[PDB]
Amino acid sequence: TTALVCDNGSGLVKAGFAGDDAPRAVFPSIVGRPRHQGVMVGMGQKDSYVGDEAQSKRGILTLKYPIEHGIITNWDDMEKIWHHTFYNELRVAPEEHPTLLTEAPLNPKANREKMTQIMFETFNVPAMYVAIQAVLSLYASGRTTGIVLDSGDGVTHNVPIYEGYALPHAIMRLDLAGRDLTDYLMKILTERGYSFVTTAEREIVRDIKEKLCYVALDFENEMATAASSSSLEKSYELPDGQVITIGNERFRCPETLFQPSFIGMESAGIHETTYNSIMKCDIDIRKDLYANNVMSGGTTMYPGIADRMQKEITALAPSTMKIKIIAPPERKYSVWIGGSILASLSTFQQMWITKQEYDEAGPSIVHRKCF
Amino acid sequence: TTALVCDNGSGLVKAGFAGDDAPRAVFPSIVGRPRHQGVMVGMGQKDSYVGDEAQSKRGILTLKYPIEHGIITNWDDMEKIWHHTFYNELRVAPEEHPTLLTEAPLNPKANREKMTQIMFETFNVPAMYVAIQAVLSLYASGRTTGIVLDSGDGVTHNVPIYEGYALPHAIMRLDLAGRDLTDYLMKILTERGYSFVTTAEREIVRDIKEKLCYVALDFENEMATAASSSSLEKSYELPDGQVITIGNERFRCPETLFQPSFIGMESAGIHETTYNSIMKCDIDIRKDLYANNVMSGGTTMYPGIADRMQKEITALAPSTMKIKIIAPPERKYSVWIGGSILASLSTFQQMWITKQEYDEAGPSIVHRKCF
Amino acid sequence: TTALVCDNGSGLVKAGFAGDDAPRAVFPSIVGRPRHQGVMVGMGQKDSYVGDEAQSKRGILTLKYPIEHGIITNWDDMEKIWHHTFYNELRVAPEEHPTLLTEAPLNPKANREKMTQIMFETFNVPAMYVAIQAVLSLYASGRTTGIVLDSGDGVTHNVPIYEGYALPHAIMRLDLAGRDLTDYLMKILTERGYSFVTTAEREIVRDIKEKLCYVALDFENEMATAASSSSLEKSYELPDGQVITIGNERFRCPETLFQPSFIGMESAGIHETTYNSIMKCDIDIRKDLYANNVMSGGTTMYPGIADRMQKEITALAPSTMKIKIIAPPERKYSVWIGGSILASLSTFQQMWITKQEYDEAGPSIVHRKCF
Ligand SMILES: Nc1ncnc2c1ncn2[C@@H]1O[C@H](COP(=O)(O)OP(=O)(O)O)[C@@H](O)[C@H]1O
Ligand SMILES: Nc1ncnc2c1ncn2[C@@H]1O[C@H](COP(=O)(O)OP(=O)(O)O)[C@@H](O)[C@H]1O
Ligand SMILES: Nc1ncnc2c1ncn2[C@@H]1O[C@H](COP(=O)(O)OP(=O)(O)O)[C@@H](O)[C@H]1O
Ligand SMILES: [Mg+2]
Ligand SMILES: [Mg+2]
Ligand SMILES: [Mg+2]
């Protein structure tokens, strides 16, 4: 039988079969419940929608995300989402397929206890595994060395690897990702009057960000240019025809990644975090880590991120080092692709947590056979 | 047992069984009593005449409408009208048929509380249920969603719906309707010397309104044409052979709907009262409401109201929208058609307020089950 | 030279000299224009009215507010109001008096830009300044650490301040204030048959809300008691001598502040707003914020509001964190008293935007020299 691969992204769930080059079913990780008094019988049924059928009817819905900063926060909702991904998107029976979930580094352990318990007692998958997304991303690049800078909707994290041996002490994590950038955009937009207040309008500001934002190579130069000319402004059309116009908001939002003092945080930017992660690693290996700066996750899709990161890290690291930021075109799906590759491997068969293992050991077993 | 459907409009009573596509009994809502002395015996009796009879003797009667601005004020007269409807018109005892009574939004709760009291304690129906009119209007059109404009004899209200879910905070009620247009037409005919005063002559200026009134496309240019030549004049034959002629009084009267400042009121004309109702909805669904604008009720029957409405809204809403005024050909009875459809459903049986529930709950029960 | 402190409210304008502990002039911020036709010669002149002379005549006027949600919607009218305050009320030649004005947080930049432009060019004041309203609201209390809850007629907004250092990420601004409660009260009044629809009647409903509305502590049980008997009902004599009797509408109105769903808004109540604001401030200062909540603005003068908000915040914070709400009885004018104090301080004399500085810098200086 062929195992599945279900990447529980913070924002979007990725799913697909083991061996597929690309995921087969992608849909935002939302649960919607209406917030108005229904009037028509035979109509407005299905108290709760999931994924696509909650986006396409969000006008009257309260969209709750069940995954917050990479940590599942509302279990009965994630159960519905898994049930959907299994029985409606892929159209598969879970009991007859192994599966490969994922997790971010340094998440509370009870999180993965509960993931495993749901998978084994509710859906009765024969065997399942829980990887760490950065390792999978480094698989996907077809590589053996690097410092995966992964960042998606919830979290931004680094994971240095050298010739197959992880360096757990050098891992750095940071809760500043796509959702926080969106929430800061909602706020900088009110300088022009555009008030977005509802959970549904978060999904409009998200796409405004996705389509219009970019990261300036140099922030102060871009601020000056925007202030002294209109060459940057770009106009966007709401769902209801209103045409909004944004200028320096196109780069003031992505720039949050590098100066988290914009959104009130104290910690340092992603470039400084990566440098401080490399400098935790033994002297003999930093030379290769500087030369394999892999990237992953959606939030690294902004134009100008790769060049900005290369410039900044070159500013940090010594003059003699050969920095290289690697940005695969499919980096949004790198984690899932690597997961498929790992699941298809010939030597991975023994590594599963068999149903018998859970029977004889409980959910705590998942800490001995996982990274 | 078959279920009855009644629609106690402010202008006419529409009543008849479910499953039919047209009301069985249609007649005006007036009870007339003599204002003169009856000298002859046997003939000249029955101090109260109702419905069509009252009109046929409107010479020697004072005609009272028990309903004014959708509110039932004279309860004795209204009970008379219902007694006529049940026994003389439909010929079927109310003691053995569930009933559905239409009603208007933002009405005093005492209104429907007393409707329930009267139906259960005076006529002893097995079960009754009260429904809004815009909801049923939408039912008739076979739609899932759309902004309904309903404008009968007394009350004009908008109820934007979405996928079977309404928006109570987006309702508007504008108590300016056919009766007020009749009064203003009566007031502006005197510019020619046709002094209509009596109520019986209100029943005739209303006939003039129903026959000749039409809504122009541009008021200023129509006035220009009217001043230019006699092309717009048309004549009408009173009951005693006199022939009248009216020019710009034909469209100056429906103009009220678009400029209630004509009759002193301040609230904005139906174009603005519909635009402002859409512009209070979730920003997501406005594009949907624009393209599914429904109409209903008699007052929307003026030749050309749909085009003026479309013009005004398209001049208000963003240029990218694709407006559509859904005007059913039978829109006069649309409320009752929708009521028949709703009463005929198999899964609507969960909504009837049974005699048992009223007896052990009191009239206040009607609010727990009625929108 | 004496300075002027002009707190432009959305419903009232509190303006006067700095140093006093009360404004020298208060008048509603409405510009009325006659709407009927004048017939008597020697009358009908002065075809645009302002303030209280636009109350006592409101019978024959359409009342329009310049500010809708702390935003200056109209400028041709706000110029009239400012001219009125400077010349007719205070009788002061503005060309020789520094003026200090106010604004809310997250308020569009063009708003204060154009305020500066008008004051420096239309009136030609030697110097001026604009201050957020939570800063002044906290000055008036004499503290230096606390999270203000300003609740005006148009806007409700918190500001966490610690030792004089604001927390710009934790400023929660909610556009739901006294005016929206006025409109909700008008909407629910009809349930009893009372129908107020026009601008003038909106003032009557404002006074009804002021006099009779109050906040309950347990809304569900308050409704239970109100339904049980008429113990809570009180009467009000409209200006023509009519008498209305409002019952549960007394506290169903200001309950909206703690359940913004009633009017369709999604955000959580103001207690939840304040608590969510607090839990985003670094952990060590939450203790000092939980004990220094300062109320302000007119809409906070509901009876029982302080008890309700204290109870509800206790329901959200942990058990051992002291929770207090400081509510000065004079709080309606807290913003203006803070403005007076700030203008009086000896060290503030350098913080003005001088006419010279504007002349050589342009409006953008407003965002530079002012917070
Ligand atoms: N082309 C893009 N440009 C900028 N941001 C993007 C782009 N595509 C996705 N994002 C952002 O990245 C996040 C989704 O990336 P993804 O890696 O799928 O997150 P997750 O793995 O948590 O589901 C979203 O917050 C989205 O706003
Ligand atoms: N063909 C028509 N043209 C213009 N006005 C009409 C026409 N028919 C009815 N009306 C007006 O609409 C009112 C009756 O229509 P209706 O929709 O049935 O109101 P209701 O249902 O409350 O009784 C009358 O007052 C009349 O003035
Ligand atoms: N006792 C009261 N109860 C409730 N609301 C009140 C009371 N007094 C005044 N208000 C409301 O406060 C508002 C005006 O007060 P104010 O603080 O000055 O608002 P603004 O900042 O715009 O000037 C009005 O909307 C009024 O309805
Ligand atoms: Mg990911
Ligand atoms: Mg009608
Ligand atoms: Mg204020």
Numbering used by the authors:
A (entry chain E), B (entry chain C), C (entry chain D): 5 to 375
Reproduce the article's own wording on this structure.
ATP-hydrolysis-coupled actin polymerization is a fundamental mechanism of cellular force generation. Actin polymerization powers fundamental cellular processes, including cell migration, organelle dynamics and endocytosis. After incorporation into F-actin, subunits rapidly hydrolyse bound ATP in seconds. F-actin polymerization is coupled to the G-to-F transition, a substantial flattening of the actin subunit that renders its nucleotide cleft active site competent for hydrolysis.
Reasoning that continuous conformational flexibility was limiting the resolution of the 16-protomer reconstruction, we focused on the central 7 subunits. Focused refinement substantially improved the resolution of both bent F-actin reconstructions (ADP–F-actin, 3.6 Å; ADP-Pi–F-actin, 3.7 Å), facilitating direct atomic model building and refinement. To examine the internal deformations of individual subunits, we superimposed each protomer with a subunit from its nucleotide-state-matched helically symmetric model and examined subdomain-averaged Cα displacements. This revealed complex displacement patterns that were dependent on a protomer’s strand membership and lattice position, primarily characterized by subunit shearing around the nucleotide cleft. Although subdomain displacement patterns were highly similar between ADP and ADP-Pi, the shearing magnitude was greater in ADP, consistent with the higher overall average curvature of bent ADP segments and enhanced deformability of ADP subunits. Notably, bent ADP–F-actin displayed significantly higher total strain in residues adjacent to the nucleotide (7.5 Å distance cut-off) compared with bent ADP-Pi–F-actin or the straight ADP–F-actin controls. Consistently, solvent-accessible volume measurements also revealed expanded nucleotide clefts in the bent ADP–F-actin protomers relative to bent ADP-Pi–F-actin and straight ADP–F-actin controls. We also examined detailed rearrangements within the subunits (Supplementary Discussion and Supplementary Videos 5 and 6). These were broadly consistent with actin’s nucleotide cleft functioning as a deformable locus that coordinates mechanical rearrangements, the rigidity of which is dependent on phosphate occupancy. Bent F-actin structures reveal rearrangements at intersubunit interfaces characterized by substantial alterations of helical twist and deformations in individual protomers, transitions that are distinct in ADP–F-actin and ADP-Pi–F-actin. This suggests that phosphate rigidifies actin subunits to alter the bending structural landscape of F-actin. Our bent actin structures support an alternative model in which phosphate both rigidifies F-actin (consistent with previous studies)33 and modifies the structural landscape evoked by bending forces, enabling discrimination by ABPs.
